[PDB]
Write a protein that holds these residues in place. Structure first.
Motif, short mmCIF file in Angstrom:
data_model
loop_
_atom_site.label_atom_id
_atom_site.label_comp_id
_atom_site.label_asym_id
_atom_site.label_seq_id
_atom_site.Cartn_x
_atom_site.Cartn_y
_atom_site.Cartn_z
N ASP A 233 45.20 40.44 35.08
CA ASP A 233 45.60 40.21 36.48
C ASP A 233 46.99 40.77 36.72
OD1 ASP A 233 43.22 38.82 37.08
OD2 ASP A 233 44.12 36.83 36.78
N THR A 234 47.87 40.75 35.72
CA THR A 234 49.24 41.26 35.97
C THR A 234 49.34 42.78 36.02
OG1 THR A 234 49.98 41.45 33.68
CG2 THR A 234 50.17 39.25 34.77
N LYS A 236 47.01 44.79 37.73
CA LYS A 236 46.38 45.43 38.90
C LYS A 236 45.22 46.44 38.62
CE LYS A 236 50.28 44.67 42.17
NZ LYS A 236 49.83 43.81 43.34
MN LIG Z 1 47.86 40.62 40.02
#
Ligand SMILES: [Mn+2]
Ligand SMILES: [Mn+2]
Ligand SMILES: [Mn+2]
Ligand SMILES: [Mn+2]
Length: 464
Positions: A233-234, A236
């Motif tokens: 998620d970090t 992208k």
């Molecule tokens: Mn994210």
């Protein structure tokens, strides 16, 4: 006896769990204390009986085998209506010697993780992967990178076509039946090694390199578990999570971990622990309270899992787990990891054939006696000031045991240990000529008519 003390790991939703505990206190006036000590899984066996051990302990099911072997867990008694509330496979994670010793809470397994911008339609089969890698390399990308160093990550493919660690049947492990070198494990590992020799994967790829490559958009796919999603998620990357590909038409077989709740065998609160777990925690409402605090991933409770599985990454997790191999909770699993690590490295490097590599691993794992032995509980049966009678469950031994070796000495105090033997027909021994006042460590070993003294004796402390 006025209360419930719960131990759970500090990375879990223990504040959500405390809310459930507060609702239980409101309905019953029983105070529920949620603690989260570090190293709790090492502490439990030291503090269980009695002092300040917990009534309830939450941990991965694979440690509960050792706890149960040690007599630290109560046999649980859910009724049929409760048993039907959880996925049947999760109940197989919390048996030890055919007896239920914990409640399944949450379920984890590896899944296939894919970059949607590189690969909107991920492969259904492992067999498609070489051709996909070719088409991607011509675009400066690879199809797949995952940790190849650890057997936990390579097992799903190795085992897909019929491999297994230990055979599980009639609710128990048959420890003599290991599936590391059968024809299924051989087909799987041959496919894996062929990917590596054909340069579709690199034999040096490890956890960090795979994770970096996927998050940097360099590879279309990786294999990893729910613990890795927040890291992706970090980045992208626009990723999906889906069912692992099949091999020879058969599902990949990832190991399945089940976060489980056990009741301390020495707890005076077993019925309250049961009510709390079955009627408060294992409900949509109770699991939601924990999940809101820290997500559980997929859960064993069918009704709440149906809600969670609207997140297809959770639905994929559960589907990979239903098709996977429950992680064995027996001590002999310890030998699995280094044995299969060696096999995979040696086959992948071309040092050995797949056949010889897995044959060596199978040998190293099966290394261990044919038969059952004494586990025992409450040994010392009679006493005088200078003499005691011990007792053990000789009936538990296989017919191969022809004698028992009894050892006794000074507890702590590093002194001469005394020893004698008795025939295998004997289930008791009088020990005598002892000091009335000291702590004694009594230990009994089984002797096999081929192998001799066996490795898993029964040992107790007593005092005259
Ligand atoms: Mn994210
Ligand atoms: Mn927290
Ligand atoms: Mn070929
Ligand atoms: Mn519901």
């Amino acid at each position: 006896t006025g209360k419930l003390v719960i131990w759970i790991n500090g990375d879990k939703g223990y504040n959500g769990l405390a809310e459930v505990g507060k609702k239980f206190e409101k309905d019953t006036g029983i105070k529920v204390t949620v603690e989260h000590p570090d190293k709790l899984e090492e502490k439990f066996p030291q503090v269980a009986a009695t002092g300040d051990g917990p009534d309830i302990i939450f941990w991965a099911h694979d440690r509960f085998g050792g706890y149960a072997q040690s007599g630290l867990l109560a046999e649980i008694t859910p009724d049929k209506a409760f048993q039907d509330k959880l996925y049947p496979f999760t109940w197989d994670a919390v048996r030890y010697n055919g007896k239920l010793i914990a409640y399944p809470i949450a379920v984890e397994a590896l899944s296939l993780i894919y970059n949607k911008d590189l690969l909107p339609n991920p492969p259904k089969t492992w067999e498609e992967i070489p051709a996909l890698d070719k088409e991607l390399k011509a675009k400066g990308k690879s199809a797949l990178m995952f940790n190849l160093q650890e057997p936990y990550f390579t097992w799903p493919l190795i085992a897909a076509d019929g491999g297994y660690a230990f055979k599980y049947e009639n609710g128990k492990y048959d420890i003599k039946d290991v599936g590391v070198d059968n024809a299924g494990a051989k087909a799987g590992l041959t496919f894996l090694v062929d990917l590596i020799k054909n340069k579709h994967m690199n034999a040096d790829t490890d956890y960090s390199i795979a994770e970096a490559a996927f998050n940097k958009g360099e590879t279309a796919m990786t294999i990893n578990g729910p613990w890795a999603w927040s890291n992706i998620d970090t980045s992208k990357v626009n990723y999906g999570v889906t069912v692992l590909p099949t091999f020879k038409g058969q599902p990949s077989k990832p190991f399945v971990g089940v976060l489980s709740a056990g009741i301390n065998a020495a707890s005076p609160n077993k019925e309250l622990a049961k009510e709390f777990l079955e009627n408060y925690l294992l409900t949509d409402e109770g699991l939601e309270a924990v999940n809101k605090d820290k997500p559980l991933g997929a859960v064993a409770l069918k009704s709440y899992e149906e809600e969670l599985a609207k997140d297809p990454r959770i639905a994929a997790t559960m589907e990979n787990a239903q098709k996977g191999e429950i992680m064995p909770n027996i001590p002999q699993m310890s030998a699995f990891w280094y044995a299969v690590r060696t096999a995979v490295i040696n086959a992948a490097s071309g040092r050995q054939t797949v056949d010889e590599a897995l044959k060596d691993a199978q040998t190293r794992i099966t290394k261990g006696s044919s038969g059952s032995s004494v586990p025992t509980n409450l040994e010392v049966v009679a006493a005088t000031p200078t003499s005691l009678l011990i007792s053990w469950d000789a009936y538990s031994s296989s017919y191969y045991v022809y004698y028992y070796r009894i050892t006794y000495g000074e507890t702590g105090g590093n002194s001469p240990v005394q020893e004698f033997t008795v025939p295998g027909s004997k289930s008791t021994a009088t020990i005598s000529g002892l000091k009335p006042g000291v702590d004694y460590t009594i230990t009994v070993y089984a002797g096999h008519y081929l192998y001799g003294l066996l490795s898993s004796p029964i040992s107790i402390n007593y005092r005259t």
